[PDB]
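Now for a chain:

_____
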Amino acid sequence: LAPVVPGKALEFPQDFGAHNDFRIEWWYVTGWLETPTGKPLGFQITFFRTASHFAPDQLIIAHVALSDPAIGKLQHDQKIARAGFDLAYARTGNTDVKLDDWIFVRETDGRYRTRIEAEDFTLTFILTPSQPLMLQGENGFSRKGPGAPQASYYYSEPHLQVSGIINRQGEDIPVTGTAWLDREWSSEYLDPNAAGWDWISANLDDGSALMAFQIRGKDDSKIWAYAALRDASGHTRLFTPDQVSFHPIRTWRSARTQAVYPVATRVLTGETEWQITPLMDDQELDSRASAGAVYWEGAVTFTRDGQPAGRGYMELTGYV
């Protein structure tokens, strides 16, 4: 029901909780891990809600992945449930999100705990904030297209410290890491002339946080674009669509879907050039059989004007 309009200030801790009066809501976690041997792994977790004893009226959709270069492709799992019916089974509420056993919870102290038991791995993590949260756009009002209604309320928690345990092959391993949380809600999806989006975020080594995206038209026009850099002084610089562009360095073709992705790319935010290198090429996640789509969810490293800068994720949609 509820529209996204400017001049509405976010308030915390209230706006950590679900926004069940809106049509759509996202909880998106991306990060890098380190095992006891020093080996890196990437992971991501998505929950997405959109709006009777069996009828699919309100829905919670989720997917998870682990990126291990030793495997060379994702290990992933994906689920969807009807929400509103059995809050014990599937719900988005004041402190958590739950789909079957998959759960994501915010503690009173601000720490996130999550247990995600998938087919080939389990993630049991604590994600501990280290910085103030980062409002996107204009104090959380973040535009995603030229139309007046084409906007989201949107913030991020960058530089989440990761602790906890991954189970794989029935073997518990403790990990450390750093992660990023996006929180977005709206009553309108992207314009349907959009083929898809490209999104990146980066936990930069100096403490800075970067997020950017573009919306791709089916005609290969740039429907919209955005970026925000919060520097080590805590100042956020915002970039207009004019100032953000994407420039592939290298493409990879999926043998599963035949889609062709810019897995390595250069992203310009004003006069600053960020280069994105993938941990591995095949980070494609096909969730179509759980009412999803084919996404590239890949852990990537960033350089800035040619120097090492940090680590993060890149998500690419609408390439099939």
